[model samples]
Target: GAMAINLTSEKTLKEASTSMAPNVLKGNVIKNKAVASGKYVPFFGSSELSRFSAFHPSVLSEKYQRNYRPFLLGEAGTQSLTQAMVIHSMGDAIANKKAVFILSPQWFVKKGVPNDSFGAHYSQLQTYQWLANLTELTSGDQYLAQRLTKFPVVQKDKVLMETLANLQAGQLPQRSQRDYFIMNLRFLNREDELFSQIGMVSREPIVEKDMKQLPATYNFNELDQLAGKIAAKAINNNKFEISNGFYRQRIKPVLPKLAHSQKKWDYRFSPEYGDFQAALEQLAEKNVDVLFVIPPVNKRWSDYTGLSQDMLQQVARKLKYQLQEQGFTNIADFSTCSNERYFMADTIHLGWRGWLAVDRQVDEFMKQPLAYQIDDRFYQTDWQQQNPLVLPQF
Candidate 1:
């Protein structure tokens, strides 16, 4: 909607509508327009990059622009780049009775990707080294790297390797050095880039990023890079989302079966929704339940944007699966298909109206009983267990 209120009070609609948006220029509000007497700053999403500025007009940019493009890059942290910001807007709706968390994927709200372009090149050499150490542990010496590489050392080496292998395979939440083949490496004797993306940097790719950063006791390089890592000119704290692959494997190919008298919906916007299938495994390690929540999209806006019911359903399913995979069975995916008015704030994020609907959905889900428990035997043989949470050359 048009803000919660009109853009201007005393000014006529023509003036408010025609005048430059306050956010574009971040300065004395009406500097350019003599008739534009009001002095209000345009609000920004949660980022600090603006295409518009004092010299630029409100309606211009490469991404979206104002008139002026500084000869060099724009000054840092003065303006907001709406798409570039991944706003984690979670709040209690329905009197704080229902707690909800949303991972709404905005294309530019960058949370995942590479940092400096240099990090990408250096990453390759590092992976090779970590692998060398692991190989030596397994075959060459069967023990710590500094030891011998023959039968005289065989007995103790075998025991140590077995213990290490079992632990590497067993830690529920911890990542295996082998699991994350890349970052574990000491490339060019420098820490490997945690990412391999040609562009952009992923903020917190795994629990480890948070595990260490949260404690802030022992220092680590990448973890330090992630700490409140401010939206720097080079860092994309909120960026892009992955195109879910689950739909192609399961949903699109089999949705005719999953839905009862299906919603007449086609798989769209996203695919399989299968991504969530593994999330529960990760969460199980953390000993947490996966609560699935589907945010509602303003149907009017959806229609305008061509984001049909099919798209929302696909998104909801993907989210639920991710939760379930993480070992969370307690789910609340009611907002997407079940309730349609609870997902938006403006054209995008959720607003009060949309949020209220979320409250109702979560409350309804919480009311359900835990009829079953997921056992270790099930996990031991589960497909996800076979693959495990490998830090994908990420």
Candidate 2:
């Protein structure tokens, strides 16, 4: 079951706050204006904030950076989300281009995973909450730092602070090893004894093996980039939006099991709903044009997950109306393309064809005039009437 809040009034805000009140006092919801109106972010925003490296204009490089065009999309896992976050943060080339948010039920609805106060996974949020608490103590306070080291992940944080302190004292880390060490650190997990070790290599030694196995025509830089891609997929299972060769072999087989597991997930539309709206508001504030896309889902996958196409369409319809009311116009809906194989790879991951399909629409949407209008491209009412879903009697 999902909890609903009234984004329309003070009463609902208070009601919603009661649900997440514990996190507010302890600091899961930080004072970040860009997150939402109540000023709280998901567990990722506070804990994994450092994970998002802010040094570069683009967090992604090589192919992702080099092949940059105007359109950008955002969310958690998919390439669309990856590209969007990069452009959202980068803002250099396509700052004024249409901003797209490609989302699915997976983002808003998840199994009722346990958490402390914020309704997030407790183990993950624990590290972030601890980080917030430690920030309250002094620079040289080993007592506070030592307290943190009790948590396995914080042991890395304790070491990181020391390195920063050393740099502040004008003792720069040695030159020859510096770039190598820094690059290694970006992908490095916290448990490493030194910054120089390639973190993924130790965790997944097979990545090195696979890299070596590739043809010699693949250059050294290419291998390193390839290794990064392999490491990301191998560790996170994020291969759905990758190349043609990888999707069928590496990703598609697991769709059925994954869909079945996700069947019971649900979302209660209230403050959570308002939070997404606030995000749209922030995007508008940045002078970026916004596009909210309901990414396509496989109908077979839908049945396995107990999510009907009509249910997802209703969600999209709801979002479409809400966004229109708030003056947003550019929404490309792929959710209604429930039967289209080209737009889906596994149960939910967008394949190359899917990306190309959306790209065509994104490009068209971008080229449209300022006074462009949206129409019911898919005959909504007609489809519903033609093949209706039967409901069970009590």
Candidate 3:
């Protein structure tokens, strides 16, 4: 069910691109260079393209940027990738000091003019197919097409879809005959492009009320135990390398960026995050600050998944409590999501107003001093299931 392209040992993105060709690529993947190749960027040469705010996380090796966008990153810009890097590059002026911050949904940028091309600016490429497309597009109008694909929208799709369904606005026949057309326009080009489009929240919602009533009711304790088991199994299968040792390795799989399709924020309970925690436990030996954030979900996602805000809020609260109980200070952005004006530009991204709100909340939380007294260090992987799910038979 999971299509993985192992890029860990990949030298030229060329090799990796040749192997996995995603059946339906949303945008063209221009080019790739091996980390050791001494090539920085294959396209968008090392210069600050635009201020276009990016919430997209970076995974590029230093060589990639310097070789490509040498000017933007030059001796300074590249350090913008990581907070620590930024602090270190600044030297004693701000070394190791906590600073103000703002993070938007990876690529949720607002449109400026009537005509704009927003392409795949957020998600990562998972296969060579994407990279190859980018390679080919490098010569023509592909970049513009890509930008057209990534831009944000103020209006919902229902109106356009209704009118277009009959007119074949996006290339359909009958008004009733419009699924693919609607899908491409509605979802094929979103900021968090790789989110599970399982119609999870398209015509419905995914809050607990819909799923929890799953023809069976279970208690919270049972759910906690189940979540713990799920985490434990993943750890065991992964050996003790998890929670620390191998998290970095896992991130590399989807590193650089998520293919437009694999864009879930949780990274689907990555063994990497688990491993990251493991390593942190040793490095800081638990003295490290443990901050967990519950990102906001848009109204569209809520409807598509049939999930209720109340349920998500409860989940957020419980999860944070779980962290606290484990001897960590965890704070859920309790005020967001419900406040549609927060991070949601449409149902998935953050416009300027929404982005700023999210930034301020996160910043305020961090700016506050550590006042809570963590008794013991711990982490609870459960808050969702009452019992281990019975894996249905093939």
Candidate 4:
């Protein structure tokens, strides 16, 4: 069933980098080649990657001719568990790589990644690839197995369900299980190669157009000031500094019901902590130097919704503890930047000035040698529910 597909072509690679399509996230062929090429840096995040603002990392890198082009991954509904699976599916292709991961506090909700959301972004190819690459069982594997088995989409695969149950029972896959995974992997991989590029959507034209908005030279102060001016013009309709289009389309329709809607929101305790640990474990195993950017929710919007700044800070502290405790110190903590004018595109996503701030951190982080040390404790449920204010010292 093998097909001679030229997925590594320069044009294909360029399209794949900005596609952010489900097929690209599910498949390994294009991503593996992109990573191995050493010219692309994997930018792992969820919906934020879709914004594609003039100050977005992809735009900045392209406009400035940076050494590495960003290989965009994930989209709306892709969370920690989904990202973990994507990283694992790539196998050793990402070893010793450098990546940028934007951590949204919104993902730290009480229930973690919703089953519907997880199911929407679920990939059998990624699941089988992960199983096929497993040499032994670890706590991370057991946790992932159990978490995945809870999903109805995953349960549809009767064979994979049984294998996951075995994994959850602290057992490695038997020969039959291993063979099934390998066979499915081979088939899925071919399917990926054949269909992954079919609906490839390139944002290169948009990026190129945005590039013209930037100055010929990369100056932080100049770009920072310009970001504000651009954003100011783009937000004439919202008092919250949300983009005019987004506010009119998304918020105005629900404006009456939105006030104080998030009064009871809490991010301090969630299964998301464990899901995030799964991602960290994979990255650490690969020794991927990662820059973790924690973006803030818009203060004005949060104020209108009665969302607590104190609770948000707690969430950030908890996240930082988890990362710093495990040696992920390259964190750009922008949790307090919520009040910065035009920093957020809407209620939660980063905007022009915010993206510019991200650019500065990413540029510095990428220039350094990255490192990490993993801790198994983060995989425990006890750690997930621990009070953020009582975090242990490193």
Q: Ten consecutive residues with minimal summed lDDT in candidate 3? A: 70-79
Q: After superposition, how far is residue 86 of candidate 3 from its true place, in Å?
A: 15
Error of 1 at 320 (Å): 4.7
Candidate 4 global TM-score: 0.96
List, residue by residue over 165-280, the lDDT tens digit for candidate 3: 32322332333323334444344334223432222111012212223322243233443344344334333432221322233465336533422332323211211222222222
* lDDT leader: 4
Best by TM-score: 4
Candidate 1 Cα lDDT to native: 0.28
Order of candidate numbers by lDDT, starting with the best: 4, 2, 1, 3
lDDT tens per residue, model 1, 1-394? 2244332333322233223232212211122121123221112222111212111112111112222211111122211111111010100111112122334433211111112211211222322333333432221111112121111322344533443444344322123544443443434223211221112121212212323323333223332243223212211221111012322443346544543332343332221122222222222322322233344544554443455555455444544444454345555454453233322333344432333333334334445442223332322213222222231210
Clashes of each: 50, 3, 58, 0
Better of 1 and 4 by lDDT: 4
- Candidate 3 regions with alpha-carbon error over 4 angstroms: 1-286, 308-310, 330-336, 349-351, 365-394
Predicted structure 4: lDDT: 0.88
Descending-TM-score candidate ranking: 4, 2, 1, 3
Clashing pairs in 4: none
TM-score for candidate 3, residues paired by index:
0.28
User: What is the Å distance of residue 65 in model 4 from its true position?
Assistant: 0.8
Reference-based lDDT, residue 323, model 4: 93
lDDT of 4 by residue, 240-352 (tens): 89889889999999998999999999999999999999999999988888989999999899999999988999999899999998889889999989889878888888889
Where model 4 places Cα greater than 4 Å from the true spot, the runs are: 1-5, 392-394
